[PDB]
Scaffold this motif. Structure first.
Motif, PDB file in Angstrom:
ATOM      1  N   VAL A  51      64.556  48.616 -66.620  1.00 39.89           N
ATOM      2  CA  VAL A  51      64.579  47.244 -67.112  1.00 39.89           C
ATOM      3  C   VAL A  51      64.871  47.127 -68.625  1.00 39.89           C
ATOM      4  CG1 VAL A  51      62.098  46.973 -67.646  1.00 39.89           C
ATOM      5  CG2 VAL A  51      63.459  45.015 -66.808  1.00 39.89           C
ATOM      6  N   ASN A  52      64.493  48.123 -69.416  1.00 44.51           N
ATOM      7  CA  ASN A  52      64.783  48.073 -70.872  1.00 44.51           C
ATOM      8  C   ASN A  52      66.253  48.010 -71.237  1.00 44.51           C
ATOM      9  OD1 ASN A  52      62.191  47.850 -71.633  1.00 44.51           O
ATOM     10  ND2 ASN A  52      61.985  49.940 -72.397  1.00 44.51           N
ATOM     11  N   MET A  53      67.089  48.587 -70.391  1.00 41.56           N
ATOM     12  CA  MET A  53      68.531  48.476 -70.564  1.00 41.56           C
ATOM     13  C   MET A  53      69.019  47.008 -70.477  1.00 41.56           C
ATOM     14  SD  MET A  53      71.468  50.590 -68.642  1.00 41.56           S
ATOM     15  CE  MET A  53      70.954  51.976 -69.617  1.00 41.56           C
ATOM     16  N   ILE A  54      68.502  46.245 -69.523  1.00 38.72           N
ATOM     17  CA  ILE A  54      68.817  44.833 -69.436  1.00 38.72           C
ATOM     18  C   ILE A  54      68.286  44.030 -70.633  1.00 38.72           C
ATOM     19  CG2 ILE A  54      68.792  42.762 -68.014  1.00 38.72           C
ATOM     20  CD1 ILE A  54      70.202  45.168 -66.874  1.00 38.72           C
ATOM     21  N   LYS A  55      67.031  44.267 -71.004  1.00 36.56           N
ATOM     22  CA  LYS A  55      66.364  43.558 -72.102  1.00 36.56           C
ATOM     23  C   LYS A  55      67.004  43.787 -73.470  1.00 36.56           C
ATOM     24  CE  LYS A  55      61.863  44.314 -71.876  1.00 36.56           C
ATOM     25  NZ  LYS A  55      60.808  45.344 -71.705  1.00 36.56           N
ATOM     26  N   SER A  56      67.527  44.974 -73.695  1.00 35.96           N
ATOM     27  CA  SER A  56      68.161  45.281 -74.967  1.00 35.96           C
ATOM     28  C   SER A  56      69.559  44.661 -75.092  1.00 35.96           C
ATOM     29  CB  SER A  56      68.219  46.807 -75.204  1.00 35.96           C
ATOM     30  OG  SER A  56      69.146  47.434 -74.324  1.00 35.96           O
ATOM     31  N   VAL A  57      70.143  44.193 -73.990  1.00 36.83           N
ATOM     32  CA  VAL A  57      71.537  43.730 -73.961  1.00 36.83           C
ATOM     33  C   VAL A  57      71.645  42.201 -73.891  1.00 36.83           C
ATOM     34  CG1 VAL A  57      73.508  43.645 -72.350  1.00 36.83           C
ATOM     35  CG2 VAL A  57      72.550  45.812 -73.020  1.00 36.83           C
ATOM     36  N   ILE A  58      70.954  41.613 -72.931  1.00 39.95           N
ATOM     37  CA  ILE A  58      71.162  40.218 -72.580  1.00 39.95           C
ATOM     38  C   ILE A  58      70.247  39.273 -73.381  1.00 39.95           C
ATOM     39  CG2 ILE A  58      70.926  38.602 -70.672  1.00 39.95           C
ATOM     40  CD1 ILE A  58      72.002  40.717 -68.849  1.00 39.95           C
ATOM     41  N   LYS A  59      70.837  38.163 -73.843  1.00 44.20           N
ATOM     42  CA  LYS A  59      70.144  37.197 -74.660  1.00 44.20           C
ATOM     43  C   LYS A  59      68.951  36.639 -73.932  1.00 44.20           C
ATOM     44  N   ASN A  60      67.822  36.652 -74.618  1.00 43.25           N
ATOM     45  CA  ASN A  60      66.551  36.186 -74.093  1.00 43.25           C
ATOM     46  C   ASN A  60      66.006  36.926 -72.880  1.00 43.25           C
ATOM     47  OD1 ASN A  60      66.291  34.236 -76.151  1.00 43.25           O
ATOM     48  ND2 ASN A  60      67.302  32.651 -74.928  1.00 43.25           N
ATOM     49  N   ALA A  61      66.588  38.063 -72.508  1.00 43.09           N
ATOM     50  CA  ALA A  61      66.078  38.814 -71.386  1.00 43.09           C
ATOM     51  C   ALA A  61      64.682  39.357 -71.679  1.00 43.09           C
ATOM     52  CB  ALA A  61      67.018  39.961 -71.020  1.00 43.09           C
ATOM     53  N   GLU A  62      64.479  39.828 -72.890  1.00 42.94           N
ATOM     54  CA  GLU A  62      63.170  40.360 -73.257  1.00 42.94           C
ATOM     55  C   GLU A  62      62.073  39.268 -73.240  1.00 42.94           C
ATOM     56  OE1 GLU A  62      63.221  42.160 -77.063  1.00 42.94           O
ATOM     57  OE2 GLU A  62      61.356  43.312 -76.684  1.00 42.94           O
ATOM     58  N   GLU A  63      62.438  38.097 -73.726  1.00 41.64           N
ATOM     59  CA  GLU A  63      61.527  36.985 -73.830  1.00 41.64           C
ATOM     60  C   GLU A  63      61.246  36.451 -72.447  1.00 41.64           C
ATOM     61  OE1 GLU A  63      64.158  37.555 -75.849  1.00 41.64           O
ATOM     62  OE2 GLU A  63      63.485  37.116 -77.895  1.00 41.64           O
ATOM     63  N   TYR A  64      62.281  36.320 -71.633  1.00 45.68           N
ATOM     64  CA  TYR A  64      62.062  35.959 -70.251  1.00 45.68           C
ATOM     65  C   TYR A  64      61.076  36.933 -69.542  1.00 45.68           C
ATOM     66  CZ  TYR A  64      62.762  35.080 -65.368  1.00 45.68           C
ATOM     67  OH  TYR A  64      62.521  34.810 -64.065  1.00 45.68           O
ATOM     68  N   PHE A  65      61.303  38.235 -69.684  1.00 44.73           N
ATOM     69  CA  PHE A  65      60.495  39.285 -69.042  1.00 44.73           C
ATOM     70  C   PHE A  65      59.038  39.234 -69.446  1.00 44.73           C
ATOM     71  CE2 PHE A  65      59.643  43.585 -67.417  1.00 44.73           C
ATOM     72  CZ  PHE A  65      58.694  44.078 -68.283  1.00 44.73           C
ATOM     73  N   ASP A  66      58.811  38.956 -70.733  1.00 51.23           N
ATOM     74  CA  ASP A  66      57.479  38.824 -71.307  1.00 51.23           C
ATOM     75  C   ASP A  66      56.849  37.483 -71.016  1.00 51.23           C
ATOM     76  OD1 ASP A  66      57.789  41.292 -72.496  1.00 51.23           O
ATOM     77  OD2 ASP A  66      58.155  40.489 -74.512  1.00 51.23           O
TER      78      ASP A  66
END
Length: 500
Positions: A101-116
């Motif tokens: 999942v970190n590969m997606i979060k580091s690339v896509i806008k707001n993916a990390e924030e969505y995940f959290d």
């Protein structure tokens, strides 16, 4: 029936693209699931897949994929941009437990924030603009993003079927697919049988009715089956002892690939927390002898952590081997002539090749450092679980590049990703250099930042014992088949195989 049969070398742990973190699962799943982009079997690059074309915004952050017409899963349900979007939502769900999942979060806008749990689903940088149009907004520009879409973590999965079947969705009777082959059946620890999927958009060019993946850790069994006409091919899992002979054969192939061999070190296990110990272990291995007498392939012995790429290449002046300096570091660490060095266990995945390498390493440490280690094999699934959960002291390791940029390698040593490298390594200066590289649009400045990060792991911290840049070996019955060739990323499309 046109049946092609091969040995791939181990039983996959999962056929779920959003959970696979390993080359066996990846090589199989890629025969069944079409990415937004697909792998290019000729170059090891990418080419149109679900998307027939794409646009990129002037500022390089917004990618717009135009899906081809009449895309359907293997049960005839349409593949729409909303279905793909729903697929991305699953991997960004904490409950899925995707280790990538970190590969997606580091690339896509707001993916990390969505995940959290901090951004609305609507604020995520993945949008279905209409049925045949998918927009992905990047956090920052990334020239290798397109090549990244070929990696399984990014491959869309059938949400209607996952919703229904949950943990059982990948069973033969339930799995539905988008690519050239469906999952006909499976015998655990023995066989994965694929059959032609008629609904593949280009089923026209698929001549094989079936592919059988034979599982077995025993290269000799595999080799005897191949000599008795019961396998059409053996990928990678060749008898390491018979390599002198295999090179002479007309059905043997070999290529340098974007893949490395290194031994990971658990920083929480003493005395591997001691930089001097880590350095001693690294300098005590004769790398050239390993590649020329034990592998005997054409692998490149190295102190490097990444392969070279068009925009990332250079010659390190670094010593491949220094037994005297290894001894000196080990004495300074508190273990002169090995005294009081504890008995550490070296884990490796069941494999004839890996055994031989581990035995050479064991012998190098005994001979040059007078320390003793114990060897221990694990079946492929257990081995992956050990790496990911840190359940090891020393473990044979390495990494196959997921995309055409040195970051795929340097990323596994970032604090948050050390599941895939050396458990518990954390150097904030390294982490910060990588962040910097993500924000540097000039290719040559970025190159220099990357080189300073790599120098920290390869010349200073030694989180791992880096050994070589891998070359893989193959047997393929080129008197019966055409349509397959080695490539630098091992991205194979076995549906392009035809009889001669």
């Amino acid at each position: 029936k046109l049946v092609f049969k091969l040995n791939i070398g181990s039983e996959p742990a999962t056929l779920d693209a959003q959970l696979i973190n390993d080359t066996v699962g990846s090589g199989i799943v890629s025969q069944m699931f079409l990415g937004i982009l697909d792998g290019d079997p000729r170059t090891g690059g990418y080419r149109p897949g679900l998307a027939k074309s794409w646009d990129i915004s002037d500022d390089g952050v917004v990618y717009t994929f135009h899906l081809r017409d009449n895309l359907v899963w293997s049960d005839g349900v349409s593949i729409t941009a909303e279905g793909i979007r729903k697929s991305y939502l699953r991997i960004l769900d904490k409950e899925t437990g995707s280790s990538f999942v970190n590969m997606i979060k580091s690339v896509i806008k707001n993916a990390e924030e969505y995940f959290d749990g901090k951004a609305n689903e609507s604020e995520l940088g993945i949008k279905a603009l209409d049925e045949k149009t998918l927009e992905i907004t990047l956090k920052s520009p990334k020239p290798y993003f397109l090549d990244m879409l070929v990696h399984q973590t990014f491959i869309p999965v059938p949400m209607h079927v996952i919703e229904k079947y949950g943990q059982r969705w990948t069973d033969p009777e339930n799995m539905v697919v988008s690519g050239p082959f469906k999952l006909k059946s499976r015998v655990l620890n023995e066989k994965v049988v694929l059959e032609k999927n008629n609904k593949y958009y280009n089923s026209k060019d698929v001549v094989l009715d079936s592919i059988i993946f034979f599982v077995t850790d025993n290269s000799i069994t595999a080799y005897n089956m191949y000599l008795n006409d019961e396998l059409d091919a053996i990928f990678k899992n060749v008898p390491p002892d018979l390599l002198k002979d295999l090179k002479l054969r007309d059905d043997y192939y070999s290529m340098g690939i974007n893949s490395t061999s290194f031994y990971s070190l658990n920083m929480k296990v003493k005395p591997l927390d001691n930089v001097k110990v880590r350095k001693a272990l690294s300098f005590a291995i004769d790398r050239k002898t390993l590649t020329e007498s034990v592998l005997n392939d054409s692998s490149i012995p190295t102190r490097r952590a990444t392969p070279d790429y068009i925009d990332y290449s250079y010659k390190s002046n670094l010593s491949l081997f220094d037994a005297e300096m290894a001894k000196k570091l080990l004495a300074d660490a508190g273990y002169p002539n090995g005294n009081n060095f504890p008995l550490l266990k070296v884990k490796y995945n069941t494999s004839d090749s890996q055994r031989k390498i581990a035995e050479f390493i064991q012998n190098q440490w005994k001979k040059n450092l007078n320390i003793n280690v114990q060897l221990e094999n694990e079946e492929w699934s257990t081995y992956i679980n050990s790496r990911v959960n840190g359940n090891y002291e020393i473990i044979r390791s390495g990494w196959s590049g997921d995309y055409a940029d040195p970051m795929t390698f340097l990323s596994i040593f970032q604090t948050e990703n050390t599941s895939f490298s050396s458990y518990g390594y954390s150097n904030s200066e390294y982490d910060e250099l990588l962040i910097k590289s993500d924000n540097e649009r000039d290719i040559f400045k970025r190159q220099e930042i990357l080189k300073k990060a790599e120098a920290i792991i390869i010349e200073r911290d030694f989180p791992a014992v880096f050994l070589n840049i891998t070359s893989s070996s193959y047997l393929f019955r080129n008197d019966k088949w055409k349509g397959w060739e080695p490539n630098i990323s091992e991205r194979f499309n076995l549906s392009e195989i035809k009889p001669i």
